[PDB]
Amino acid sequence: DVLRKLAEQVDDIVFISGTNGKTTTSNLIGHTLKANNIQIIHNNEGANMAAGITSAFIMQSTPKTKIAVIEIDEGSIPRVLKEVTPSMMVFTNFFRDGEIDIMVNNIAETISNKGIKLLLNADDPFVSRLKIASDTIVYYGMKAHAHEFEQSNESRYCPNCGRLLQYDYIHYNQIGHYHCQCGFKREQAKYEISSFDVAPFLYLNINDEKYDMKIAGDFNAYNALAAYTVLRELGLNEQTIKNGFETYTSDNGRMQYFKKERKEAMINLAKNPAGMNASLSVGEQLEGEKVYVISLNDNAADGRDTSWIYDADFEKLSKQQIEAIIVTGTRAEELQLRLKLAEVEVPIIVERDIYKATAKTMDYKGFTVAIPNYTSLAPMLEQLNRSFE
Amino acid sequence: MHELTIYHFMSDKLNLYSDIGNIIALRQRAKKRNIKVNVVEINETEGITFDECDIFFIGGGSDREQALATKELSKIKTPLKEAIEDGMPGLTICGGYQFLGKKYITPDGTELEGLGILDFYTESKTNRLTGDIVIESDTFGTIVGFENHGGRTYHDFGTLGHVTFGYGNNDEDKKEGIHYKNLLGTYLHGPILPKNYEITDYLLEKACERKGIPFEPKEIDNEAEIQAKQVLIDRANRQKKSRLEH
Ligand SMILES: [Mg+2]
Ligand SMILES: [Zn+2]
Secondary structure, X not given: OHHHHHXXXXXXXXXEEOOOOHHHHHHHHHHHHHOOOOOEEEOOOOOOOHHXXXXXXXXXXXXXXXXXXXXXXXHHHXXXXXXXXXXXXXXXXXXXXXXXXXXXXXXXXHHOOOOOEEEEEOOOHHHHHHHHHOOOEEEEEEOOOOOOOOOOOOOOEOOOOOOEOOEEEEEEOOEEEEEOOOOOEOOOOOEEEEEEEEOOOEEEEEOOEEEEOOOOOOOHHHHHHHHHHHHHHOOOOHHHHHHHHOOOOOOOOOOEEEEEOOEEEEEOOOOOHHHHHHHHHHHHOOOXXXXXXXXXOOOOOOOOOOHHHHOOOHHHHHHOOEEEEEEEOOOHHHHHHHHHHOOOOOXXXXXXXXXXXXXXXXXXXXXXXXXXXXXXXXXXXXXXXXXXX | OOXXXXXXXXXXXXXXXXXXXXXXXXXXXXXXXXXXXXXXXXXXXXXXXXXXXXXXXXXXXXXXXHHHHHHHHHHHHHHHHHHHHOOOOEEEEOHHHHOOOOEEEOOOOOEEEOXXXXXXXXXXXXXXXXXXXXXXXXXXXXXXXXXXXXXXXXXXXXXXXXXXXXXXXXXXXXXXXXXXXXXXXXXXXXXXXXXXXXXXXXXXXHHHHHHOXXXXXOOOOOHHHHHHHHHHXXXXXXXXXXXXXX
16 A cells, blocks of 8 residues: 555656666666656666566655656466556567567556556567557657668567558568558557667667767667657656767677776677677777777586687788787686787787776776677676776 | 788688688788788589698588598599608698597597598597697697687697696697698687697698798797787686696
8 A cells, every 4th residue: 555655746748668678768767867867756777567666666756856757577467457547658679588468568558547658669560569558658760771680570469450461661570561451550669760870879860859879789679769768758858868878878798888087998798709800890890999808718608628719710810900908807817818919919918906907097098899708798897897996 | 922822712601700810910920021921712523632731721611521621632642642741841731630540439429531641530428528728839839729628639749848837738748739741730719820820830831831932030939929829828828727636
């Protein structure tokens, strides 16, 4: 009975759900609101069921917090909505991993005729099916040919009439511009990505404004737009959103960005040839000169056989503007030798202590590219956090 | 320009990390001696001759890949044997080494046929010989790498040297690999050649002598290689003192 009284004290309650992208969407909203000194309630990826959401409202309610930003497991929506009515709900997507159909129906029944503003992904037909659950619908989505996604292939049923759903254009899998002869279709979008690229971070064109972000991943474009839509619907203007979006970053050491005045860094885990080739190609999409710190441990979880580094394309480093490469970890010397054999002719510094190696990159004005394998990640990420405070 | 041709056999395998690094190491030590290396990949062997070969290389694959590679290599078993008997330098890794012998026995007792170039056999168990390996050789100086193999190879030929830490060919001999005329065979990973420049230089120098071209300068900078070797030598030494103090 207590959650109800806590929630009534909050003017705006935003729920984020769907099967994917909940956390990034939620974090982008919460980061952008806090960066404008707005006090909020905000839960996390380990606390998106009923019990964890209730705990978030108890722990974080103060007289100043007038917005809650709540990610919620899609299965938890009925149990929670017996206690809290959000003012708006954004849905990212529903992926089966006819099981989607049933779950979407249960969600529709739960939120119907409650006055909730729904922000639906027009490009996902199972998210869009939720239009029957409210009279206040806001559509977001992506224009055809905004990006060529990696691509993957079946026929799906119209949630309204049981025909096979016709598609005019497919972003990927079920996500696309669909149109059924019964009227069910990809609706016109109020907020739309017309174009985006990842090079190496997300760069988005949303309603003819450019959003230069600090996270990566093609899939994250839709999460950014879902977050953008919430924030516009809360009344924030494009510049205020641009300020928050330009500084949000991941926190798991995957394409994670750092900045302190004119010094920049990014860290990306690489533990095999494909991952290393990808991490080495990030540097070349980065303007100006670079400094590298590359770490190769050979602890049990890394494997003891470091031979794979000879299948990585370290030679490509000769095509980049690089001040120095610091090699570190317990097999730092294997990396020095690999770079010698790669004919990469730049100062190479052996510093086996990962904390000392990582700190050292702060002495260079170039863009730090930090590339650890698995057991190198935690010490290298810890030092980067320390160095960039 | 002075040139050496490397015959890279059966490079069509799912993985070839060992293969590529060994080729890189040879190319780069030769380049320092003003020698260009030409790599010929041979996956169809019919009518292949060794007249244009200076050094050959046979890596290792899965047991399936190895059995396929052996069936294709047997179409030129006799020229390969004659080449080897004539002193052709060659490097063979794991399955490429084992299947120069007469047979390879799997843990489940299945006998696989090798080329029979040399009269030996290999018997694998489920418990593997695995860890750092340090070998002391008169020809190759200190050899260092990583071993991880179920196979025990039993031959009566020369080897790459005495194993001061690790196992080598089998549980008992404390000797690693095979060295027969100019043919080398090993279980070592790393791959073996990047750190172990004396082995790389051995194969290139025998090839230059056989062709009648210089191998010069003989002494170049080995510092990076030495520093990489020293990490494993030191770790091996730490590991020994721990057992003696046990
Ligand atoms: Mg893409
Ligand atoms: Zn329909």
